[PDB]
Structure formats: C-alpha cells, structure tokens
Write a protein that binds this ligand. Structure first.
Ligand SMILES: NC(=O)c1ccc[n+]([C@@H]2O[C@H](COP(=O)([O-])OP(=O)(O)OC[C@H]3O[C@@H](n4cnc5c(N)ncnc54)[C@H](O)[C@@H]3O)[C@@H](O)[C@H]2O)c1
Ligand SMILES: NC(=O)c1ccc[n+]([C@@H]2O[C@H](COP(=O)([O-])OP(=O)(O)OC[C@H]3O[C@@H](n4cnc5c(N)ncnc54)[C@H](O)[C@@H]3O)[C@@H](O)[C@H]2O)c1
Lengths: 662, 657
C-alpha cells in the first residue's frame, strides 16, 4: 500500500528513458510480441544451486579445495571439463545429480514474467521452474530442451530451454555446462540455436537474470553485431546488480545494442536485496500495463481517443461491443447509462463525463485534445452513451434506423444504384442495395471489385466486410439454385434459370476450398487488435446467448412476486426489446447481408411471440388479482411502425395465426 | 480419369499426399515455390538473361546448357565489366513486365499453406494471394522481418524488385550467392526455422537446383533426425530414374514425380503440374475408407479420447464425426451430409454378423470390442431404418444425486488412491458444504496433474474451481449484506485471508480463453467440452423445448387426440441425458439456476400433458371402444427432480392447474 505509492513514486522518478523502456515493453506485451530471455539470477532467488557452487564442487573434488575466487568465464567452463576428462563422466553426472536433483520452490518473479503475457520465454536454465510456474498459472508452452523437440512441438508459444534440461536424466549430455558443450553448440544444437535467433529478430526481448558480462549475453551481442542496422528491435536489459551502472558501461552496452533498466538506480536497496531490485523493475512494467499510472485529463482523453478512433469507420456500434472494447472495465447498458466493472485504477470515463458536464473543464484542455473531445462527444451522442447510472434519471429511448433497405425505398435504391459512385463506401452500399433487390450476380461482381480495390487502398474494414458479404451472397445463390432445381420448376409451372451455367461454373471454380473460419486470423495483428469486435461476424452461427436469455419472459413466479432484477428497476421485456432493436440497427445500418438468413428471422419471431405472450399473461394476472375494472381491457404490449414492419417481414401466415389465437 | 490415377498411385504417392493434405488441415504445410511455377506464366526464365548478358558481353549465345557456375558467373562478369547500370538495364527490360497468375499458383493457395518461401523476384505468388484474398506478410529484405505484421510470411529469399529493378535488391550474380548469409542473416534463419517446424513441399525446382542442393547440405548437418523429410514435386517431362530416386531420397527428400503419376509429351508442363498439384493432393483431401479394418481403426481413433469421461451426450456426438451422421436421443443413427463410404453402417453390420467380426485381423478385435462396449453403454443401438422396439430407461449412479450424505462423508474420510478419487472427493465436498476444502482439493489436483495425462481432468478441475469461487463470492455477498438479517448474526463462514487469497490468485483468470490456451491436440480431440465453458451447453435443448411446448399447447387448444407415441418423450429423454451427463461426470453445473429453470419447465410441460391425457379416457372411450393406453406416472427419479428443482410457488401453481 505505502509501497504501492512508492512504486508510483519510482514511476514518477523514472527518467523518460525508463518510462520509454517500460512503454515499449508494455505495448509489446499487449501486442503479443514480447519475449523474456530469463537467466540464472531469476532462479538463484529460489536457491537453485548457483553455478559457481558446482564449479566449486568440481574444483574441490578434482584438486582438493575451493579456488581463490572470482571464477572467470574460462574457469566456469573448464573446471567442469577437467573433472569430466580426468575424474570421469559418470561422476560428473553424480555431482550434477546431487545439486540439481533438489526440488526448489517458485519465486515471485516467475509469475511476473508470465503475468506480462510473454509470447515465448527463452532460458539458459536446466531447472524446471519456469516450466512449473507456467503450469500453476495454466499457461501452456512447448518446452524445447532438445533438438528432437523443435519439430515435434504443438504450440507456437515456446519455452525454449537453450542449454538443455534434466528432464531426460541428470547427465551432462542432456545439458550445456562444460567447455565443449559451449564450443560445439551450433553443431550440436542447430535448430534450437536458430529458433532463438528468429524469435529475437521478430519479438521484443527483455533480459532478466543475467549480468552484462554473462557469456551468453555477450555472444548474442556479437551476433547482433552482424545483423543489419535497424533490421532488429533493440533488446531491453534488466540489471539487478546491487549498484548503479557506471555511466561508461551504460553507454558501451547501449551502443552494443542493449537498453539497460538498472533497478539499482530505480530503487534503493541493500547489497543483498536482489529480489527487491527485480520486483522494482518488474512491477513498474506490470502496473504500467494496467494503465494504473494516469492522473491528467489529457491522458484519459488520449487513451479514450486511441481506443475509440478505429470505430469511426462504422455507422453504429452495439452496446455489448463497447464492453469488449474497454476490456470489461465498464458495463454498457441498453438504457444508455454506463457503470464501473472490475476497474482498478483511474475512473477515466468518470473524468470524461465530468468534462462533458462542465464547459470550463473542457476549456482547460489543449486544442488538439479539444478537437479529440469534440469528435468523441459526437460519436457518443450518435451511438447513445449517457452519464453514469448514479447520475441517471428519466432516460427516454426511441428507435430510429437510417437505411433505405429497411423502409423498402426500392425506387430510391434503384436511383442511387444508377448514379455514379465516388467512394468505396458508396460502392459497398451499392452492392448491398443490389443484393437487397435480388440482383446477385451484379452484387458479387461489385464485391469482387471492392475487394480488389480495398487491399490496395489499405481499407481493411471494407475488405473484410466485403469478403464476408460475398461469401454470404455465394451461399444464398447456391441455396436458391438448389431450391429452383429441386422444386422451382413445379410450383412456377415452368423451369426458371435466373443464373447462367457459365456464371455458376465460374463462382464454383473461384471459391474452391474456401474457409471463412481463418479469414480473421490472417488479417494483420493491428487490425485484430483494433477491430476484434467484428470477429463474431465470421462465425457459422450467432444470436445464441440472446435466444437463451429469453427464458426470463417465461417466468411465472414474477407475477406473484417480481423484483425487477434485470438492469436497474427494469423488466426483462424492455431489456429484450432494446437488445432486439440494437441488433436490428447494427445489422441494417452496417449493410450486412446476414439479415436475410433464417436464424435472424427465427430469433425475431421467438422474441416477439414471447414478449406478446408475457404481456397477455401479465394482463390476465392483473385482471385476476384485482377487480375486472382494473386493467380489464389494458394492453400490456404497445405496437408501432417498427413492430409492424418487423412482423410483416419476419413472420409467416402460420406464425401470425398462432399469435392471434394465442 | 483421375480415378485411375488415384488407383494407380502407389502407397508412396498416397502417403505423401496424405501427409501433405493432413499437415494442411492442421495449418503447417509450406510450399517452397521455385522458377518453374513462374515460367508457366511465361516469365523470363533466368537463362534467358544469362544469355542476354552472354550476348552483350561476348556477342552470341552460349549454345549449351548453362551450368551451376555459368548461371552465377556470366551475370557477374557483365557486372564487373559492363557495370551496374547495364546490369540493371537488362534487369528492367526483361523483368518490368506483367504476367498472369498461372493455375498452379491458385492451387497452392488453395492448400491454404501456412507460409510460402520462394526464390522468385516476380510478384505472381503475391498477386494470386491478393486475388484469392489470402494475406501474407512479404519479407524480401532484411528489414522486413522486424516490421512484419502477421504470422504468415511470403519469404522471398532471393529478394524482389519491389523496391526497383536494381540488382542490389536481388540474388542472381555470384557474389550475391557467396555472401548470402552475411547479407541476409535474418531471412536465412527464418527460412530454416520454418523448414524445421513445418512440412516443406518444394515445387518449381529440379533435383539439381543450386538451392535445393544447398538446403540438403544443411539438413545433413542437422544430423539429429530432427527434420521432417521435405517432399519434392518433380515435374520434368521424363520419368525420374531409380538410381537418383534412391540417392536423393537418402539425402533427405520425398520425390513425387508427376511424370510417373501421369504420362505426357515433352513440353506438357501445366499438365504434369496440375495432376500432382491438385488433381491428387487437393482431390485426396478426404478419407480413404475402403476396407473392413480401416473402419474399425478410424472409429477407434475418433472414439478413444472419450474413454476418459464416463458418459457422452448423444447430441454431442454430432460434433464428434463432423456432422457426418445424425444421432437421435432414442439411439438411432441417420445418414446426413456423408458422401463417402458408410462406416457406421458397416460397423452395425459387423455387430449383427459374427462371421464379419471373425474376418477382422488380430490386434483389431479388441478395438471392436471396446467400441461395442462404449456404444452399448452410451445407448447407441443401430441405424434408423432397421429400428426395432426402442425402450426407455433411467439409471443414474451418482452418489450425490441420491442424497446419501453419510456415504459421501465416509468416502471423503477414506484415503484416495488416484486423481479420479480426488476429483470425486472434491465434488462430494462441494455438495456437502465445504467450499474451502473443495477449492483446495481442486487446486491440489491442478498442481498434481503435471504428469502425462489427457488434460481432461485438469480442464474440468479448473472450471470447477472457477465455479466454486463464483459461488463463494455470491455466498459472501448475500452473507455480509443479507446473512445478518437472515440469521440475526454476522456469520463468517470464511476468513478474510482466504477470500483475499482466492481473489488474488484468479484475478487474471478468464474462462473465455481457457479452452484456447490448451494444446492443439486437446482441442481437436475434446472439442465437445468447449461448450461446458458457457451457456452454449444448453442451447439446442432449450430451443427444442420451446418448439415442443408451442406444438403441444397448439394441439391442446385444437383438442385433437392422437393414437401414437407421445410427442413429449424427446423432452424427457433429453432431460435425463443431460442429468446423467452432468451428474456422472462430477460437474458443478448442476447447481446453476438456468438448469433448474429448464428442468422445471420440462417437467411442468410433461405433467400438464399427462393430466390432459388422463381425461381423454372419458371422451374418446365414451363414444367408441377405440382408445389408447399409454400414459405418464410418477416415479422416484421424477419425485427427486421435482423436490430439488421446484419452488413452493411452482408446485402450488401446478396443483391449481
Ligand atoms: N564465480 C563468482 O564470481 C562467485 C564465486 C563465489 C561466490 N559468488 C557469489 O555469487 C553471487 C552472485 O554471482 P553470480 O555467480 O550469480 O554472477 P553475477 O553476480 O554476475 O550474476 C548475474 C545476475 O544474477 C543475479 N543474482 C546474483 N545473485 C543473486 C541472488 N542471490 N539472488 C537473486 N539474483 C541474483 C543478479 O541480479 C545479476 O543480474 C555473488 O553475490 C557472490 O557472492 C560468486
Ligand atoms: N539449360 C539452360 O539454361 C537452358 C538454355 C536454353 C533453353 N533451355 C530450355 O528451358 C527448359 C527448362 O530449363 P531449366 O534449366 O530451367 O530446367 P530445370 O530442370 O532446371 O527446371 C527446374 C524445374 O522447372 C520445371 N520446368 C522447366 N520448364 C518448365 C515450364 N516451361 N513450365 C513449368 N515448369 C517447367 C522443371 O520440370 C523442373 O522441375 C528446358 O527444357 C530447355 O529446353 C534451358
């Protein structure tokens, strides 16, 4: 608690450089492209026998007593080999076994490194501690200690254990410890050597547990020396030695390709408080990831703008989608009021609403922030966002859909189609209108053209939506052809051929072995991060949770005793109606063809029928409980133009008769 | 016609085709695309330019086959003597030209390759990609590796002229090849890491290619049998001899000579390409069930992982076989969306006939026995058309269902011997009133399941622990706020430290990603369990109940009287199947409120239908002797269900109605 503030004090103290390091690392963490090269120090915390202690065992067994001290890199690798060569190989394995067979505990740092959502973890350790913490937390990684495993992996995420491991047996052949092990590494570990390097090239590397004079750190530095300048992202280093890095050192290693983050300088601790140093440099990143470090109105404005700007390409956003956009930090209700939800940090949305309420506070902001605030205000007013539920009141709700297709303006749609397009969005709307009028070959051609142009235009959204709509158009064409060939000729009295053989053959040939499941995955990770809410558009079926939620309308105990638990003092009727309206508006305003499928019609029918049945039952129970004059002819369900058109479009004669007689 | 080709395909060919297809359905195939593919699109073959340099340098063509040396030297002699400008001039002239995406390009992208490494300077693979609508990050220069934005890559290992038709952006002359790893260290490694972790299928190269031969000399060094032998799609007119087939096969390759697959004239290239490319590999994407033993092996492969569980819902089986057949609640099997050999019908025929079972070879009768036992226990009887007199029975062996609390206490007290006993003990503790002990035991099981296993018990323990934590949180919420008034005292079932610890431990846990984070092998083997992590477990049954309620109430209003089987039997069958599945697998989902509501609705509809069918014996039997006898009557299981899943208000309402 007090330290929490001290962590923030450290955070305040962080020079721009440490903040930048933390910044890129935290962004990388989120992108899914961080890797941690975890060395020995992170396990000396768990007391895993340090190496000098084993090099020392060998010195004492070999010659007779411990060395002077300061084993260099050479002695680190040669005393093990001398013993191996002179005292034996089966003894070498016994010394190892005695020290390394001891099961140690798992440190706090092991879960922090894993808390940052590391894409992979490279490690020059034989211990199975990263590999146990992984399991405790549930993070499944593919451990690669041996060459044989490089190809027999399962996940793309990896626990690359360079320098082997004792999973197969405590023998110095299953690990890299002595001089020859390190000398012939490339020859004896070709695939693991490469896997480490490709990962270093692509993902961001944050070293933790190594010295700057470590053998491995300086080996990688010589490889990176070869790499082309700016062909690689510089790796970060976490120096947890117990003192400030001599500025000279900082520079040399900085130029060699490191970006040190000395903990000794970021906090103050005793000479032997190694864990403290780790936690300091490690916590700044963890908290920073959570965006807990934020105080200014400009900061929350920038955060919300960065989160919201990509959605401007759309026309309407469902209230449920906003929950996923903000990562469950807030609940977005159909009523338009938003509430806090598992948010441990600054109330940025509270600040945004407070700014909206008061003009002077808005004037306090800068000019660019003022423009961003204006844009966000416009977007929120369009999508229907109100202040917090605490500050709520007699909020109203009206349904309005801006779409010529919904209102059946066939003449206006044809006139628009006949016009000359000016933008790709106009082409998308034209294709949707063509599909709505039954002209499906023209819609397919226009969607193909839009797909061809968007990829070059860098319009990922239109590209994705056009691909989905083209697939749906192809499916509709296929089912229509099957129906016409199966029964169309009989009922019509004559065989009808709306589509020529050449077009059918061409579409069959072009869309062969097509898979809509992998469409979203292949898009760049930037798009997947910005527009994740659209993933559900690629699923085979949807609107299942909404259908399941209809059970509440079938409840009977509510009439005897109802608490209005749904939302805040709202019945399930209003919630379901607003959910249906939101779904309808989102589908119709975004020009999506999925409206024309059986599932949507069935969902609409079920919702409307259950709502009307609940209204009738409520009226009957009200009449029964009180006198007949009380609600004798009261109508618990009120209809409007939108309900009329919905019923007309989505109900059959049998459904209407069943509703009327029910 | 390809049927004959298929028939002819030797075991070798079909084995190659099998692995290539299967790797693709997993997402691990990679195509090494060479020059030939682009010559199908009449792109200047290299020797055309080697010969252009050999003419502007010397004065004529080499009138001979360019060796591996002259391919790389003639370009360099010209560069060293005629300069960079002209070198790049001929480059612009021959290569600044548009050519069409040949058919083989699309075939390749139809295999949905994970990556496409290529030694081509052209952009034909890239165009086919955009046209197909398949994205790939193109890496053709060192810098591109660090700035890529996708997992998939179009690694152009010899550069491309996308940055201009200069020779500085490509590998063609000799110095470029000699200093390759020095100049392209990142792309060199990337290719090699993919080769190691993906199945490579070369296409567009000859066995004597410089590149093919260099890769093979590196695989020699791998020297740990840690590499998947790369397939090589030969497509030269003549048939590959045997001496070479042996030598190059030993050197690391798996040749698939198209000449052997299909006969052709000396210059029929797109023909040899297509046959091996799609008319075989792509056309063989399906199964090859043609023997009495392959049926048993396939069924055992699809059914073995389910042995870890105790019972399987019949409806869920629809997803096990990928919609190949419809499984009905009454135990009947119907064909649906299956165009290949009928293997379940063959299995049923073998079950009926003992001689067919005797025909099975050794080591396969035990698998048939296990499958027969599993199907008999699950209740699958036979195919629909051969249906006999189906029967209905109820049997739940779960101890907690019958409310034998003392027996569960004794079981908990007794020592455990296997993690299954620990799971049962955790379920018993949850059903007895110990949330802390159940949580601790679930955590213990999660910790101790590190050893090799199917990963099922670990996943179920995680889900159960999450649900138990949710129940603990709700209990605390209604204790600290309402427990004071309910009992008049501040009841403290759990200490603050335990609550804080459990809150801290899973503050980052997200049930949504629990299934995705599991190994890929588990996902393709135990996919049915995914629905256990959301309300999708109870979607189809609820819709069916709604439809049946609507139909039954419509018939009630009409007043018709059928003389056949009751139309609400499916509701009872689904209800009992769901109860058995949830109770025999020791799952906490039995405690959910939506499950209680569904049970209440189903039994209320059943009771209403029974009450209506009770009174019909006075109208239909009063005007004519013709009538019916079938009905519904109370029993122990229904009594327990009602006592557990109904409130006093619902029972009073049913009594009134
Ligand atoms: N060969 C030797 O130099 C030698 C000989 C005898 C004793 N020691 C002892 O070993 C200790 C560490 O030296 P080293 O061999 O690891 O090389 P080192 O000090 O270069 O270690 C590099 C990294 O290991 C981490 N680390 C070191 N000791 C740690 C600890 N106790 N807990 C957590 N992290 C730790 C540090 O954060 C550092 O970043 C020294 O304090 C020294 O007393 C070293
Ligand atoms: N040796 C030369 O440099 C040279 C000189 C002049 C003419 N040619 C002519 O060019 C042809 C191929 O020359 P190469 O040295 O590249 O052969 P190659 O064997 O090196 O070709 C490599 C791969 O490309 C394939 N391939 C060859 N021609 C193809 C085509 N037109 N379409 C599709 N795939 C094709 C081959 O089957 C082989 O698998 C020869 O038939 C020859 O008549 C070659």
């Amino acid at each position: 608690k007090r330290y929490g503030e001290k962590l923030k004090e450290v955070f305040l103290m962080l020079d721009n450089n440490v903040v930048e390091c933390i910044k890129e690392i935290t962004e990388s963490s989120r992108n899914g492209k961080l890797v941690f090269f975890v060395g020995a120090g992170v396990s000396t915390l768990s007391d895993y026998p340090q190496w000098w202690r084993l090099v020392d065992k060998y010195h004492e067994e070999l010659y007779g007593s411990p060395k002077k001290g300061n084993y260099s890199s050479d002695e680190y690798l040669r005393i093990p080999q001398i013993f191996y060569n002179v005292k034996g190989e089966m003894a070498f394995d016994g010394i190892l076994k005695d020290f390394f067979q001891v099961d140690k505990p798992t440190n706090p740092i092991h879960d922090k490194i894993l808390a940052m959502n590391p894409a992979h973890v490279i490690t020059t350790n034989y211990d199975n501690l990263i590999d146990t913490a992984c399991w405790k937390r549930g993070k499944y990684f593919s451990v690669i200690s041996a060459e044989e495993d490089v190809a027999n992996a399962t996940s793309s995420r990896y626990l690359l254990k360079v320098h082997g491991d004792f999973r197969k047996g405590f023998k110095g052949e299953n690990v890299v410890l002595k001089e020859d092990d390190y000398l012939n590494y490339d020859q004896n570990y070709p695939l693991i050597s490469n896997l480490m390097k490709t990962i270093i090239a692509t993902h961001t590397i944050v070293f933790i547990g190594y010295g700057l004079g470590d053998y491995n750190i300086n080996m990688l530095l010589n490889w990176v020396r070869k790499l082309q300048k700016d062909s690689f992202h510089k790796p970060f280093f976490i120096r947890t030695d117990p003192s400030p890095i001599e500025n000279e050192t900082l520079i040399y290693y900085e130029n060699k390709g490191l970006r040190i983050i000395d903990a000794a300088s970021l906090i103050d601790s005793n000479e032997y408080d190694y864990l403290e140093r780790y936690s300091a440099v490690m916590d700044l990143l963890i908290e920073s990831q959570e965006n807990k470090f934020i105080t200014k109105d400009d900061e929350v404005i920038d955060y919300i703008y960065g989160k919201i700007s990509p959605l401007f390409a759309l026309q309407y956003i469902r209230k449920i989608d906003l929950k996923h956009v903000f990562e469950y930090d807030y609940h977005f209700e159909v009523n338009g009021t938003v509430v806090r939800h598992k948010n441990k940090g600054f109330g940025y949305m509270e600040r945004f609403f407070e700014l909206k309420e008061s003009c002077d506070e808005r004037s306090k902001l800068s000019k660019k922030q003022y423009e961003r605030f204006n844009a966000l205000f416009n977007f929120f007013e369009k999508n229907g966002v109100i202040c917090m539920a605490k500050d709520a009141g007699t909020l109203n709700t009206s349904i309005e859909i801006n779409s010529l297709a919904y209102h059946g303006k066939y003449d206006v749609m044809k006139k628009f189609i006949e016009e000359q397009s000016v933008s790709i969005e106009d082409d998308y709307k034209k294709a949707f209108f063509l599909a709505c009028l039954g002209r499906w070959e023209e819609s397919y051609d226009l969607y193909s053209n839009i797909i061809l142009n968007s990829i070059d235009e860098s319009n990922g959204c239109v590209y994705y939506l056009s691909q989905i709509n083209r697939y749906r158009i192809y499916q509709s064409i296929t089912q229509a052809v099957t129906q016409f060939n199966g029964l169309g000729l009989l009922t019509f009295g004559r065989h009808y051929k709306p589509f020529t053989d050449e077009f059918l053959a061409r579409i069959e040939r072009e869309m062969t072995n097509f898979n809509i499941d992998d469409l979203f995955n292949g898009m760049p990770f930037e798009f997947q991060k910005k527009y994740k809410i659209l993933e559900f558009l690629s699923d085979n079926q949807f609107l299942y949770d909404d259908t399941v939620k209809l059970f509440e309308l079938t409840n009977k105990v509510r009439s005897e005793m109802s608490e209005g638990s749904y939302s805040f003092g709202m019945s399930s009727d209003i919630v379901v109606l607003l959910r249906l309206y939101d779904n309808l508006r989102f589908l119709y305003e975004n020009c999506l063809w999925s409206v024309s499928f059986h599932e949507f019609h069935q969902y609409i029918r079920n919702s409307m029928s259950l709502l009307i049945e609940k209204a009738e039952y409520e009226r009957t129970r009200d009449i029964d409980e009180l006198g007949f004059s009380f609600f004798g002819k009261k109508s618990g369900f009120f209809m409007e133009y939108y309900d009329f058109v919905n019923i007309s479009r989505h109900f059959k004669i049998d459904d209407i008769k069943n509703l009327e007689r029910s």
